Design an enzyme around this catalytic site. Sequence first.
Site, PDB file in Angstrom:
ATOM      1  N   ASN A 184       0.747  -1.207   0.187  1.00 56.02           N
ATOM      2  CA  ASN A 184      -0.083   0.012  -0.037  1.00 56.02           C
ATOM      3  C   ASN A 184       0.803   1.325   0.029  1.00 56.02           C
ATOM      4  O   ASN A 184       0.360   2.298   0.366  1.00 56.02           O
ATOM      5  CB  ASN A 184      -1.097  -0.041   1.089  1.00 56.02           C
ATOM      6  CG  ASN A 184      -0.330   0.237   2.514  1.00 56.02           C
ATOM      7  OD1 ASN A 184       0.713   0.369   2.577  1.00 56.02           O
ATOM      8  ND2 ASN A 184      -1.102  -0.067   3.384  1.00 56.02           N
ATOM      9  N   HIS A 257      -1.716   7.301   9.353  1.00 60.13           N
ATOM     10  CA  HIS A 257      -1.376   6.019   9.627  1.00 60.13           C
ATOM     11  C   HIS A 257      -1.985   5.918  11.319  1.00 60.13           C
ATOM     12  O   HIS A 257      -1.195   6.678  11.903  1.00 60.13           O
ATOM     13  CB  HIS A 257      -0.020   5.492   9.638  1.00 60.13           C
ATOM     14  CG  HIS A 257       0.219   4.113  10.362  1.00 60.13           C
ATOM     15  ND1 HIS A 257       0.208   2.874   9.788  1.00 60.13           N
ATOM     16  CD2 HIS A 257       0.445   3.900  11.634  1.00 60.13           C
ATOM     17  CE1 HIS A 257       0.512   2.102  10.636  1.00 60.13           C
ATOM     18  NE2 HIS A 257       0.297   2.312  11.758  1.00 60.13           N
ATOM     19  N   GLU A 365      17.952 -17.226  14.740  1.00 62.74           N
ATOM     20  CA  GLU A 365      17.205 -17.571  15.988  1.00 62.74           C
ATOM     21  C   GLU A 365      15.777 -16.864  16.111  1.00 62.74           C
ATOM     22  O   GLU A 365      15.081 -17.567  16.865  1.00 62.74           O
ATOM     23  CB  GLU A 365      17.964 -17.258  17.181  1.00 62.74           C
ATOM     24  CG  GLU A 365      19.419 -17.545  17.239  1.00 62.74           C
ATOM     25  CD  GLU A 365      20.604 -17.138  16.253  1.00 62.74           C
ATOM     26  OE1 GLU A 365      20.222 -16.130  15.789  1.00 62.74           O
ATOM     27  OE2 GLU A 365      21.556 -17.919  16.293  1.00 62.74           O
TER      28      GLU A 365
HETATM   29  C1  LIG Z   1      23.867 -15.333  16.423  1.00 62.93           C
HETATM   30  C2  LIG Z   1      24.770 -16.548  16.328  1.00 62.93           C
HETATM   31  N1  LIG Z   1      24.240 -17.693  16.268  1.00 62.93           N
HETATM   32  C3  LIG Z   1      24.810 -18.813  16.392  1.00 62.93           C
HETATM   33  C4  LIG Z   1      26.244 -18.637  16.358  1.00 62.93           C
HETATM   34  C5  LIG Z   1      27.017 -19.892  16.673  1.00 62.93           C
HETATM   35  N2  LIG Z   1      28.145 -20.147  15.762  1.00 62.93           N
HETATM   36  C6  LIG Z   1      29.332 -19.868  15.568  1.00 62.93           C
HETATM   37  C7  LIG Z   1      30.108 -20.015  16.939  1.00 62.93           C
HETATM   38  O1  LIG Z   1      29.536 -19.342  17.909  1.00 62.93           O
HETATM   39  C8  LIG Z   1      31.613 -19.102  16.710  1.00 62.93           C
HETATM   40  O2  LIG Z   1      31.219 -17.667  16.495  1.00 62.93           O
HETATM   41  C9  LIG Z   1      30.629 -21.561  17.211  1.00 62.93           C
HETATM   42  O3  LIG Z   1      31.349 -22.122  16.317  1.00 62.93           O
HETATM   43  C10 LIG Z   1      31.210 -21.696  18.771  1.00 62.93           C
HETATM   44  O4  LIG Z   1      32.333 -21.165  18.920  1.00 62.93           O
HETATM   45  C11 LIG Z   1      31.145 -23.158  18.681  1.00 62.93           C
HETATM   46  O5  LIG Z   1      31.127 -23.356  20.420  1.00 62.93           O
HETATM   47  P1  LIG Z   1      31.464 -24.685  20.902  1.00 62.93           P
HETATM   48  O6  LIG Z   1      31.591 -24.630  22.699  1.00 62.93           O
HETATM   49  O7  LIG Z   1      30.861 -25.692  20.669  1.00 62.93           O
HETATM   50  O8  LIG Z   1      33.268 -25.056  20.507  1.00 62.93           O
HETATM   51  S1  LIG Z   1      30.053 -19.745  14.105  1.00 62.93           S
HETATM   52  C12 LIG Z   1      28.717 -20.631  13.335  1.00 62.93           C
HETATM   53  C13 LIG Z   1      28.797 -21.126  11.796  1.00 62.93           C
HETATM   54  C14 LIG Z   1      29.258 -19.946  10.980  1.00 62.93           C
HETATM   55  O9  LIG Z   1      28.975 -20.325   9.719  1.00 62.93           O
HETATM   56  P2  LIG Z   1      29.612 -19.433   8.522  1.00 62.93           P
HETATM   57  O10 LIG Z   1      28.530 -18.058   8.618  1.00 62.93           O
HETATM   58  O11 LIG Z   1      29.317 -20.173   7.377  1.00 62.93           O
HETATM   59  O12 LIG Z   1      31.001 -19.307   8.730  1.00 62.93           O
HETATM   60  P3  LIG Z   1      32.265 -20.059   8.234  1.00 62.93           P
HETATM   61  O13 LIG Z   1      32.880 -20.547   9.481  1.00 62.93           O
HETATM   62  O14 LIG Z   1      32.078 -21.144   7.462  1.00 62.93           O
HETATM   63  O15 LIG Z   1      33.107 -19.026   7.500  1.00 62.93           O
HETATM   64  C15 LIG Z   1      27.769 -20.628  14.207  1.00 62.93           C
HETATM   65  C16 LIG Z   1      26.427 -21.133  14.026  1.00 62.93           C
HETATM   66  C17 LIG Z   1      26.870 -17.530  16.592  1.00 62.93           C
HETATM   67  N3  LIG Z   1      28.298 -17.298  17.031  1.00 62.93           N
HETATM   68  N4  LIG Z   1      25.992 -16.249  16.256  1.00 62.93           N
HETATM   69  C1  LIG Z   2       8.548  -4.389  15.217  1.00 62.05           C
HETATM   70  C2  LIG Z   2       7.571  -3.063  15.493  1.00 62.05           C
HETATM   71  N1  LIG Z   2       8.250  -2.074  15.044  1.00 62.05           N
HETATM   72  C3  LIG Z   2       7.494  -0.919  14.980  1.00 62.05           C
HETATM   73  C4  LIG Z   2       6.148  -0.937  14.895  1.00 62.05           C
HETATM   74  C5  LIG Z   2       5.175   0.281  15.151  1.00 62.05           C
HETATM   75  N2  LIG Z   2       4.355   0.329  14.037  1.00 62.05           N
HETATM   76  C6  LIG Z   2       2.924  -0.003  14.036  1.00 62.05           C
HETATM   77  C7  LIG Z   2       2.195   0.069  15.451  1.00 62.05           C
HETATM   78  O1  LIG Z   2       2.837  -0.409  16.520  1.00 62.05           O
HETATM   79  C8  LIG Z   2       0.741  -0.495  15.350  1.00 62.05           C
HETATM   80  O2  LIG Z   2       1.034  -2.004  15.247  1.00 62.05           O
HETATM   81  C9  LIG Z   2       1.988   1.841  15.578  1.00 62.05           C
HETATM   82  O3  LIG Z   2       1.053   2.202  14.341  1.00 62.05           O
HETATM   83  C10 LIG Z   2       1.195   1.982  16.789  1.00 62.05           C
HETATM   84  O4  LIG Z   2      -0.065   1.805  17.006  1.00 62.05           O
HETATM   85  C11 LIG Z   2       1.202   3.458  17.039  1.00 62.05           C
HETATM   86  O5  LIG Z   2       0.897   4.116  18.389  1.00 62.05           O
HETATM   87  P1  LIG Z   2       0.760   5.466  18.820  1.00 62.05           P
HETATM   88  O6  LIG Z   2       0.783   5.546  20.207  1.00 62.05           O
HETATM   89  O7  LIG Z   2       1.611   6.577  18.126  1.00 62.05           O
HETATM   90  O8  LIG Z   2      -0.729   5.740  18.110  1.00 62.05           O
HETATM   91  S1  LIG Z   2       2.246  -0.291  12.616  1.00 62.05           S
HETATM   92  C12 LIG Z   2       3.635   0.373  11.933  1.00 62.05           C
HETATM   93  C13 LIG Z   2       3.585   0.614  10.293  1.00 62.05           C
HETATM   94  C14 LIG Z   2       3.403  -0.389   9.512  1.00 62.05           C
HETATM   95  O9  LIG Z   2       3.381  -0.418   8.057  1.00 62.05           O
HETATM   96  P2  LIG Z   2       3.099  -1.474   7.150  1.00 62.05           P
HETATM   97  O10 LIG Z   2       3.653  -2.633   7.344  1.00 62.05           O
HETATM   98  O11 LIG Z   2       3.509  -0.990   5.781  1.00 62.05           O
HETATM   99  O12 LIG Z   2       1.445  -1.673   7.164  1.00 62.05           O
HETATM  100  P3  LIG Z   2       0.414  -0.977   6.908  1.00 62.05           P
HETATM  101  O13 LIG Z   2      -0.296  -0.339   7.999  1.00 62.05           O
HETATM  102  O14 LIG Z   2       0.545   0.077   5.646  1.00 62.05           O
HETATM  103  O15 LIG Z   2      -0.849  -1.859   6.256  1.00 62.05           O
HETATM  104  C15 LIG Z   2       4.770   0.688  12.549  1.00 62.05           C
HETATM  105  C16 LIG Z   2       6.249   1.086  12.241  1.00 62.05           C
HETATM  106  C17 LIG Z   2       5.501  -2.228  15.333  1.00 62.05           C
HETATM  107  N3  LIG Z   2       4.347  -2.453  15.553  1.00 62.05           N
HETATM  108  N4  LIG Z   2       6.422  -3.442  15.388  1.00 62.05           N
HETATM  109 MG   LIG Z   3       1.901  -0.181   4.294  1.00 56.14          MG
END
Ligand SMILES: Cc1ncc(C[n+]2c([C@](O)(CO)[C@@H](O)[C@H](O)COP(=O)(O)O)sc(CCOP(=O)(O)OP(=O)(O)O)c2C)c(N)n1
Ligand SMILES: Cc1ncc(C[n+]2c([C@](O)(CO)[C@@H](O)[C@H](O)COP(=O)(O)O)sc(CCOP(=O)(O)OP(=O)(O)O)c2C)c(N)n1
Ligand SMILES: [Mg+2]
EC number: 2.2.1.1
Lengths: 621, 621
Positions: A184, A257, A365
């Site tokens: 929209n 909005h 996650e």
């Molecule tokens: C946001 C997020 N989610 C998951 C992970 C885990 N992770 C990584 C490590 O955290 C290293 O940064 C992990 O290997 C730990 O060291 C393991 O701990 P142990 O106690 O088991 O030894 S790294 C990773 C996989 C990344 O893959 P790619 O992006 O392809 O990178 P590459 O190595 O192939 O180049 C994961 C899931 C983290 N850290 N963050």
């Molecule tokens: C994760 C996340 N981040 C930001 C927002 C805020 N937000 C929305 C509302 O939270 C409604 O769900 C917001 O309008 C509040 O009601 C405002 O409160 P007031 O106290 O100011 O009145 S909605 C929104 C914008 C979404 O735009 P589109 O995805 O394009 O949807 P559409 O309306 O155009 O169809 C934002 C930034 C939320 N909620 N979540």
């Molecule tokens: Mg919209």
Amino acid sequence: ESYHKPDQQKLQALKDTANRLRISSIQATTAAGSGHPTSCCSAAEIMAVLFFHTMRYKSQDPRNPHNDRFVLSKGHAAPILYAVWAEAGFLAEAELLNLRKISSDLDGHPVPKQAFTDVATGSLGQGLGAACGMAYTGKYFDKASYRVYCLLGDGELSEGSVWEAMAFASIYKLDNLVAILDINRLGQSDPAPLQHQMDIYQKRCEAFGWHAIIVDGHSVEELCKAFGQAKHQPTAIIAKTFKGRGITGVEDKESWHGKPLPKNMAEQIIQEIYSQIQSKKKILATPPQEDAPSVDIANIRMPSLPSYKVGDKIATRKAYGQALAKLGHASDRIIALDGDTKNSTFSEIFKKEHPDRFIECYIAEQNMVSIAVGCATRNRTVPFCSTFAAFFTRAFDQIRMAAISESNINLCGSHCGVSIGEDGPSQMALEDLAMFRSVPTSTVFYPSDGVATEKAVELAANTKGICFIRTSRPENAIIYNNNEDFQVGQAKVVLKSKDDQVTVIGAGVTLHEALAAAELLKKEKINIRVLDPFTIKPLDRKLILDSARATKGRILTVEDHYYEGGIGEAVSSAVVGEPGITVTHLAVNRVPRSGKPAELLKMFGIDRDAIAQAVRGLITK
Amino acid sequence: ESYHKPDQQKLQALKDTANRLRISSIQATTAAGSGHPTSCCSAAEIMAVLFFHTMRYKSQDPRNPHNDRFVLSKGHAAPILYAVWAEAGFLAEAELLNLRKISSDLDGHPVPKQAFTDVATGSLGQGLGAACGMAYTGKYFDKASYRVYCLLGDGELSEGSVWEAMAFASIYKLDNLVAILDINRLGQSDPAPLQHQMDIYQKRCEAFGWHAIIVDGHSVEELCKAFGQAKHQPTAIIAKTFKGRGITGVEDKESWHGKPLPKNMAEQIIQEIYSQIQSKKKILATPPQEDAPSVDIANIRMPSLPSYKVGDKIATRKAYGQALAKLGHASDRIIALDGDTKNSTFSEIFKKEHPDRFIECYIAEQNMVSIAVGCATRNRTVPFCSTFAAFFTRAFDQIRMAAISESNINLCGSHCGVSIGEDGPSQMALEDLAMFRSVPTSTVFYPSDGVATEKAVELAANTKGICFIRTSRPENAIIYNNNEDFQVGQAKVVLKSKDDQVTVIGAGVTLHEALAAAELLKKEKINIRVLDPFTIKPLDRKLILDSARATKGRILTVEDHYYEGGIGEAVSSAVVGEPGITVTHLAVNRVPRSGKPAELLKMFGIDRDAIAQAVRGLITK
Ligand SMILES: Cc1ncc(C[n+]2c([C@](O)(CO)[C@@H](O)[C@H](O)COP(=O)(O)O)sc(CCOP(=O)(O)OP(=O)(O)O)c2C)c(N)n1
Ligand SMILES: Cc1ncc(C[n+]2c([C@](O)(CO)[C@@H](O)[C@H](O)COP(=O)(O)O)sc(CCOP(=O)(O)OP(=O)(O)O)c2C)c(N)n1
Ligand SMILES: [Mg+2]
Ligand SMILES: [Mg+2]
Ligand code: NA
Ligand code: NA
């Protein structure tokens, strides 16, 4: 079943429906004095076609397991959701005018106290992930004919969680899932980045593996047709719409909005819209094919007691994987999810034994939690999702919304605290107790050995709400007999004597450090009582105070966590004002650093020597 | 400056460099007994070419403001980052062998105690957003010639935060930014979803507005050439690589992520790699064009005192926007960021007055925080980012990592508590105090009127660490004189008499409810002391206890927040054991619902009548 190609009369009735939905959205939000009618109006044809041509559901039983699912990801369009369920005959039409009142359940955003709502979606960008869990469940677990439809805003598509879901759906071939994008042009405070560049939306969706169809989102015929063809991919219906469609002088305008129409304006606009309606006669919903299986609801019990030997060593992360795999043999309802960490969390053990019930979620996650929420809807499965506890912070909003969704999911976060050692603070969960304790439906388990871990998995499976199990990287001795009884909210005194001078509360690695401290202090003819909480939330306040009354009122808490929101604060909050009761805390005071586990426990003041010194200073205070 | 097209000798030297980097990564991780050599080895040619052909930087001054920036988003490749900085002459080569030791700063993942590291990146998927902030700063604020390079893993690309950054960079035309994607086929525990489907990576990057080039990531020539051409778009170098490249029998294999080579194996592999090296002579770094401007470091002061009148009414969310705009007139260092909520948070006021210093981040809270972190690096700007406090939960991992990054960012979260009314719980921040208190470098401001809000903005601007300001949706009376002095860690007694029976601690809306309760109770000849914390972290423990000693030891805390981790727990933790000191709590006990603000304060037990009843029950206890 064949597509029923609508005649002009049916198309006109869908148009009439859409316009009724506009009128109700305006009426309800004007009555409330708040809400988002312009966000409803862009979606009115989409909603009419989905509810009154495409989807199959029991209008009088919205939670029926055979029904198609609808997820309103753009949850601020709630008034039009309520209006469709009135149009379908489930809600009384008069109730729509009670939107947002404390006397109504037609709240500002959808919530599961409404029979027609499975997940709460007011935090944008989460609905598609829940929908993916529903669709995965339909295709792979239930093996049923229901389809899943998810309506998103265009501004909403800026959330990265949406794109995680996009990718998940194409990885897992969710050909039973449809995403409808309400393009929209506008967000809350400005145009959405891509405005009406429909081709760029299509390229993004196609690049992420979806079949993408651009439609006029105000054409009921185009919508019927696009919805009426199943695919072998997840399908994105990219609908070009105008915000405030049908509201003369507001359609396609900024500054509207979340603004209700004033009463004088609503009256004039409603008359205009009403003049477009050709018939008052409503379309009826069409029911589903009843092929969803029966799911049992019984308690899930481990097939045998734990088989761990006192004095053997195991990390609680490995005990988790062992316990989860074991419980999977007892019930087919258990499913496991992990974010590319299964070899670290030991969820790989479950995958080996029960591969059909393991969902690899990759390094995503936020989406993992939403998939779990969707899988748990309508009690179809009992999900356990795992990663490092630190990385659950990536999914806090999804967890927060899971509680608002009254979801029953289980989360196991490994690698807690500084005791992981060498990876350093990026991997160290030091705020996870704070985070999970703040989730109002949570139960927080912190098992200190393998036996307690297995008992926590079993208890979590049978406990409602957001269950969190905090597991640890290093190996620790088994201290509990295999037949020790464990309960939510029941702590254990693991060391006591009649002359104990302090009650020391530890958990995981710090329980074992407290036991070593007790051995140190015995040298000095000082005895300490040592208490293992088992659950941090709820906390066994009675045993803690009974213990403290036996130890001159003195409590010392020691935790591999930051000071705020953890065990020490829980204990303090529970006992503050109790006469002669004092609480002293040891915790981690700042961002850590790399080193060996024992070295970091020392550096950060939570190892056996720190505990022994704190005990002595109490006694000599 | 023209591309210098390398000769064969230079190419061979880059190959030799890459192989030296492999050897060091192996040596260091074998010595440590932990780490990720196979993740280093896939990136070795990329690192050699960036550091020794493409980028421009002062090797002896890694933080120099004129330097190109490099962000290692795949932070577990830290050993190869350390190795390049040894190769460049900044680090001593012997120190590399002390990886992960408690005696070293060569920690498991990069951290800003290292001069060569700006942001900590061990939580995957965050580096590109920080890099976007650096690039935005370079192009629009510094208006300087430095470029920004960010190396990502392929598994990492599953994080939605990456795609938020992708979209940001094309919206903002960051033609000074290069993302290098190490497409080594594998993640931690399985192949990455797309494996070596290079064309799909290219389509995704192009759909998100980047110029995308597929290269052989082990060809130094292809890398030199691809890096050597500037674009008018952000550029993605999509590098086909093999995990463990150069490690015979490990290259391209599963089961090797995060596994060090055993010592016998390292020796054999290192000899193999060493046999490929043609010369020991190292390439020298090339310095930058020195065109980054001077930034002042002075305190930032409001241009005048607040000009709010006692008894006037203003919401603290609006006072925030007014105060931020005002401070922007005093310093050009202030920048504002918001996530499509500027009309709700009132950051729109800043945008109106200072549009060049406002960054619209759209509905993408994770990326917004990372942009702010990147903008704050090297002290280039003083960022204030805003959204609803509830939606900061979406960015908790970025905030957590910001503290690990020792970042100085300011966050203002509006719409706290049930007092927002009708939107319902999705919009209600009830866990934000828990969240921000758990961030170890945080200062938590909770201003109760417009004057306090303006003072909090000024104080935050001049305070290091993660500053959080909690603002409120409804209007409240101004209670403070414009010349009231405010300080971090200093509370205010806003009502007192000599016969006060309870000290009531409230904040924001609950401060005003406590003042109304005091008026109620006066009817009953009961006086209460009322205390406004100002900062929740750090808490003015001295004034709280001095107050409580004046009021028979009795404290009552009342907060628009859940029980765990908020004001009540902070107070309890601070005063537990103090003789004759008792603490009673009123807070929100469960997920709320829609209604009018006053109705919800009543329902959830935190309004004037609840406070009055709690006071009476203390007195009669
Ligand atoms: C946001 C997020 N989610 C998951 C992970 C885990 N992770 C990584 C490590 O955290 C290293 O940064 C992990 O290997 C730990 O060291 C393991 O701990 P142990 O106690 O088991 O030894 S790294 C990773 C996989 C990344 O893959 P790619 O992006 O392809 O990178 P590459 O190595 O192939 O180049 C994961 C899931 C983290 N850290 N963050
Ligand atoms: C994760 C996340 N981040 C930001 C927002 C805020 N937000 C929305 C509302 O939270 C409604 O769900 C917001 O309008 C509040 O009601 C405002 O409160 P007031 O106290 O100011 O009145 S909605 C929104 C914008 C979404 O735009 P589109 O995805 O394009 O949807 P559409 O309306 O155009 O169809 C934002 C930034 C939320 N909620 N979540
Ligand atoms: Mg919209
Ligand atoms: Mg990889
Ligand atoms: Na459970
Ligand atoms: Na600050």
